[PDB]
Amino acid sequence: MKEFYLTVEQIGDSIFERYIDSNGRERTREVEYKPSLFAHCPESQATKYFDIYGKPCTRKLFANMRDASQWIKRMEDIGLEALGMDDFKLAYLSDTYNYEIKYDHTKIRVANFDIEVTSPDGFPEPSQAKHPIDAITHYDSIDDRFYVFDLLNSPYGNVEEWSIEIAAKLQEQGGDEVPSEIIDKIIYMPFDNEKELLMEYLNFWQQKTPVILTGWNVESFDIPYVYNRIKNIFGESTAKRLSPHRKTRVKVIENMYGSREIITLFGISVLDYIDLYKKFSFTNQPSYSLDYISEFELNVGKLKYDGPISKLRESNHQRYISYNIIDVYRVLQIDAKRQFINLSLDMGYYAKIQIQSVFSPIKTWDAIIFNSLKEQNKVIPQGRSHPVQPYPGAFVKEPIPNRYKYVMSFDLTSLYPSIIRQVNISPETIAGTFKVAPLHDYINAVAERPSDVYSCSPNGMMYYKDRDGVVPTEITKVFNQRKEHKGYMLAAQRNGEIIKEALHNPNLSVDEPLDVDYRFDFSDEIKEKIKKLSAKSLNEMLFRAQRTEVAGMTAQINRKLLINSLYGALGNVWFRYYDLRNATAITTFGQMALQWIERKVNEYLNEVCGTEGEAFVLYGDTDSIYVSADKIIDKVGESKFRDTNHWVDFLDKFARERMEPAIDRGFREMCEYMNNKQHLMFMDREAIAGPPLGSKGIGGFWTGKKRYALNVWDMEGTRYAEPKLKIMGLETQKSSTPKAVQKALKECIRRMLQEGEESLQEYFKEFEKEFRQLNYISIASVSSANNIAKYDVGGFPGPKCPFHIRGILTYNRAIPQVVEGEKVYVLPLREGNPFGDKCIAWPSGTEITDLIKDDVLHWMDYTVLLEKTFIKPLEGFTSAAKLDYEKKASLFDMFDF
Numbered sequence: 001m002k003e004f005y006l007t008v009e010q011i012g013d014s015i016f017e018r019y020i021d022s023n024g025r026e027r028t029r030e031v032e033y034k035p036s037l038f039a040h041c042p043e044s045q046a047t048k049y050f051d052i053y054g055k056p057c058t059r060k061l062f063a064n065m066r067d068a069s070q071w072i073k074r075m076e077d078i079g080l081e082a083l084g085m086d087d088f089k090l091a092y093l094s095d096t097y098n099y100e101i102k103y104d105h106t107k108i109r110v111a112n113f114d115i116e117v118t119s120p121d122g123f124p125e126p127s128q129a130k131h132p133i134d135a136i137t138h139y140d141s142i143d144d145r146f147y148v149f150d151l152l153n154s155p156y157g158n159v160e161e162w163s164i165e166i167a168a169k170l171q172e173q174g175g176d177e178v179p180s181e182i183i184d185k186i187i188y189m190p191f192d193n194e195k196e197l198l199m200e201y202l203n204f205w206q207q208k209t210p211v212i213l214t215g216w217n218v219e220s221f222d223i224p225y226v227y228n229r230i231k232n233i234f235g236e237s238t239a240k241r242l243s244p245h246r247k248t249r250v251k252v253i254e255n256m257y258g259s260r261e262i263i264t265l266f267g268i269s270v271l272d273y274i275d276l277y278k279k280f281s282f283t284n285q286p287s288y289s290l291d292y293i294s295e296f297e298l299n300v301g302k303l304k305y306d307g308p309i310s311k312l313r314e315s316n317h318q319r320y321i322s323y324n325i326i327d328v329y330r331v332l333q334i335d336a337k338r339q340f341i342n343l344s345l346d347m348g349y350y351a352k353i354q355i356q357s358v359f360s361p362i363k364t365w366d367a368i369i370f371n372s373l374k375e376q377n378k379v380i381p382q383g384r385s386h387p388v389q390p391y392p393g394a395f396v397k398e399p400i401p402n403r404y405k406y407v408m409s410f411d412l413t414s415l416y417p418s419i420i421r422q423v424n425i426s427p428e429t430i431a432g433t434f435k436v437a438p439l440h441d442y443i444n445a446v447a448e449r450p451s452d453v454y455s456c457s458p459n460g461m462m463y464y465k466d467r468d469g470v471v472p473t474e475i476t477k478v479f480n481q482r483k484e485h486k487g488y489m490l491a492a493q494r495n496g497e498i499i500k501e502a503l504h505n506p507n508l509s510v511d512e513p514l515d516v517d518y519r520f521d522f523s524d525e526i527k528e529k530i531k532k533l534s535a536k537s538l539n540e541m542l543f544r545a546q547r548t549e550v551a552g553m554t555a556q557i558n559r560k561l562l563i564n565s566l567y568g569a570l571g572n573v574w575f576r577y578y579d580l581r582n583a584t585a586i587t588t589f590g591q592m593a594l595q596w597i598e599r600k601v602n603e604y605l606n607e608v609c610g611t612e613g614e615a616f617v618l619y620g621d622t623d624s625i626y627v628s629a630d631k632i633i634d635k636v637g638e639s640k641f642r643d644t645n646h647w648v649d650f651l652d653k654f655a656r657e658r659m660e661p662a663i664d665r666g667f668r669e670m671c672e673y674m675n676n677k678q679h680l681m682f683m684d685r686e687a688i689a690g691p692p693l694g695s696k697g698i699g700g701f702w703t704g705k706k707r708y709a710l711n712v713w714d715m716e717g718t719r720y721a722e723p724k725l726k727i728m729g730l731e732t733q734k735s736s737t738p739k740a741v742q743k744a745l746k747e748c749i750r751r752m753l754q755e756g757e758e759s760l761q762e763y764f765k766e767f768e769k770e771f772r773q774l775n776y777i778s779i780a781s782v783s784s785a786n787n788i789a790k791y792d793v794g795g796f797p798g799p800k801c802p803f804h805i806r807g808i809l810t811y812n813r814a815i816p817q818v819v820e821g822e823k824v825y826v827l828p829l830r831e832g833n834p835f836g837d838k839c840i841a842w843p844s845g846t847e848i849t850d851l852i853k854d855d856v857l858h859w860m861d862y863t864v865l866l867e868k869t870f871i872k873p874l875e876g877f878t879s880a881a882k883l884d885y886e887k888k889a890s891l892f893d894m895f896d897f
């Protein structure tokens with residue numbers, strides 16, 4: 001079989017590679033790679049190698065990688081360009097795997113692990129590793145087993161062994177409810193001292209060395225801590241055994257507050273799952289803790305345990321070990337439905353890069369373009385340094401703060417990559433420049449046509465229309481590949497149905513599943529044989545068809561991500577193909593496109609509605625516009641509609657049959673104005689929002705850029721039974737917003753948009769009345785404790801001290817401990833309180849210690865709390881929407897109705 005690599009590393013003059021050989025067995029080899037680079041040569045020198053500009057090149061084959069590195073330096077000193085792939089790992093992978101890689105993930109050892117550490121304060125510093133590791137949960141994908149290393153004796157407490165029988169029992173039976181499916185997959189190993197624990201873990205590691213090392217927050221805590229702990233206890237040499245090549249690299253990261261440590265283990269690809277999640281998930285959750293993402297993805301309640309998390313081992317060691325196991329399973333569950341690990345492998349093998357490079361758009365695209373050009377004997381340009389110069393970003397319209405009853409949004413398809421293809425922007429397609437007028441002149445089409453022969457962008461750049469272009473050609477390839485895999489996905493879908501229709505009274509005769517390609521529709525002859533297969537064979541065929549569907553899904557999602565990350569690479573000064581002029585040409589064209597279409601839509605709606613100078617477009621952000629449909633609805637007459645679904649259908653039709661054609665018309669004109677290579681500005685209806693028919697709801701409101709709320713009924717063709725609240729930038733989900741207030745503010749917004757001012761006013765009165773009976777933890781706000789010592793002057797706040805830091809200081813005077821950088825709950829205190837200040841703070845996720853809890857709660861300033869956390873932000877919403885959360889005085893007040 002075709003072999004595939006696992007990991008690759010460069011150590012001196014050799015490439016250390018772990019891979020799956022022809023016999024499907026994992027192996028390691030050291031290769032004295034002889035790299036090739038290129039230098040320009042005279043036309044006289046005949047060759048097949050040319051750079052992207054068409055200039056001839058000659059190949060230089062080196063004896064070793066060190067010589068190639070020196071040569072580059074020598075060329076640079078002189079001033080000559082040194083072309084070719086300077087990252088020898090990519091060159092090696094490109095030469096060694098000169099074919100489309102077909103990998104088998106079941107042979108790739110993926111470890112998902114977790115390291116637990118008890119400490120008096122509860123947030124031990126990884127770079128120090130001053131405390132013992134008292135629990136290690138290591139799930140191995142090949143063995144499909146959870147290895148649990150449990151420390152029984154510790155200076156922080158001696159405990160008894162974990163009970164695998166108690167773990168399964170339900171909550172009421174005093175159990176932990178460890179899923180029945182994984183109970184038999186647990187290998188529990190108790191230890192009396194940390195040294196034996198760690199040494200056995202280290203041996204275990206040498207036998208089942210991870211290829212892919214993952215888990216939640218593994219890069220910032222687990223890895224650094226175990227590496228440093230082993231280093232402190234057994235010495236650096238022992239710690240280096242965590243790397244199959246005994247080579248390690250410790251990088252220190254600087255930040256506003258402190259320094260972090262990141263350990264690179266040669267021979268291992270670390271993919272912290274929290275980062276993998278943040279990169280591939282198409283959302284932006286207000287929190288990325290395992291509990292939050294678990295509830296969101298798996299819809300399961302966060303683990304429950306009384307008391308602080310740093311006290312869980314001492315207070316309930318049984319639940320401590322059971323939960324560590326469950327948390328790892330949780331990550332595994334999240335990967336089961338999101339498939340991010342596999343997505344990483346798919347993307348990695350596609351680009352032919354180290355798997356961990358998926359976190360780097362420039363690295364990924366560099367390899368893709370490199371391998372693609374190599375097939376045409378084209379040589380890549382040497383990377384050149386560029387200063388970080390800020391250039392125009394996306395266009396975001398300043399909205400008029402107000403309520404907007406009916407809104408309809410439209411958006412462009414893959415904007416930036418489409419612009420690249422439309423204008424044909426690439427380093428080698430630059431054809432010149434033209435005298436540029438102000439941007440508003442192109443938007444209004446008052447400026448003279450830039451060029452009659454070249455494709456233009458509003459920033460003053462011109463490109464050839466006749467030439468393909470490396471960047472645009474590569475985008476197109478990926479786009480065509482996405483459709484191809486989409487086709488396989490659908491084919492494996494129709495084939496799956498043919499197999500299911502057969503599972504209805506299948507023949508009993510014994511047979512085997514057919515050897516067919518599920519990516520293509522079944523031929524006639526295949527469908528006839530399928531009519532005679534037994535259930536056993538059909539079920540096996542269904543399993544394979546689905547396996548094919550998923551692979552198709554992963555492949556097309558991979559391509560989508562590649563396309564969406566390209567612009568980021570092109571705007572990165574470290575990208576080989578970066579060009580400030582091209583980055584600017586893309587963004588300014590984007591800005592022109594949105595404002596040009598905003599003018600077109602306004603002109604069209606004023607005409608159609610017989611109005612004048614009316615502003616229909618109320619907001620726009622990057623690739624979408626929001627249109628007020630109030631006038632459109634009035635034109636028809638609201639009493640003319642039967643129900644909500646009626647006006648929604650009307651706007652859907654109006655958008656599709658009227659506005660869209662006008663928009664397409666507007667964009668084709670812009671394309672001719674800029675004389676672009678091809679029209680790709682495709683904008684169509686996205687959402688339709690408004691209040692339910694016959695209600696007094698306001699539908700939606702904007703407070704400013706990126707701050708608004710909409711009551712959505714339809715999203716690109718899919719009609720919702722229950723409207724969905726689209727809320728953005730109103731901080732109703734922000735971690736600093738108290739729990740009860742997050743729910744209250746949302747309810748306030750739902751009522752405003754769906755029921756009206758009156759309903760809002762009754763809920764406001766209701767929440768305010770109930771506020772003082774809610775649990776104190778649910779109404780406290782949350783802040784991060786940064787720079788505590790800075791304002792710590794003899795125990796009291798120095799000048800310019802933050803409100804929450806002041807709280808932390810009064811807490812310290814009063815007395816869990818507050819750890820630098822960590823989060824804390826904050827509560828204001830009434831004047832005359834015994835704590836000596838206007839507020840107090842304590843560790844988040846915990847109750848206030850008993851010695852002061854009741855005093856604190858008795859001095860809590862509920863009024864100030866309510867005003868600051870609830871009323872202030874609500875007032876922001878209502879002022880923008882022109883409403884009162886409190887009924888204004890009326891002449892009818894003095895009456896008793």
Ligand SMILES: Nc1nc2c(ncn2[C@@H]2O[C@H](CO)[C@@H](O)[C@H]2O)c(=O)[nH]1
Nearest residue numbers: 036084085091095374377378379380
């Ligand atoms: N065509 C091409 N080959 C390259 C480049 N950089 C390195 N090579 C090497 O050229 C050789 C094969 O044609 C291999 O050893 C490649 O790794 C580049 O930009 N283009």
Ligand SMILES: [K+]
Nearest residue numbers: 216217290327
């Ligand atoms: K964790």
Ligand SMILES: [K+]
Nearest residue numbers: 303323324327
């Ligand atoms: K836990």
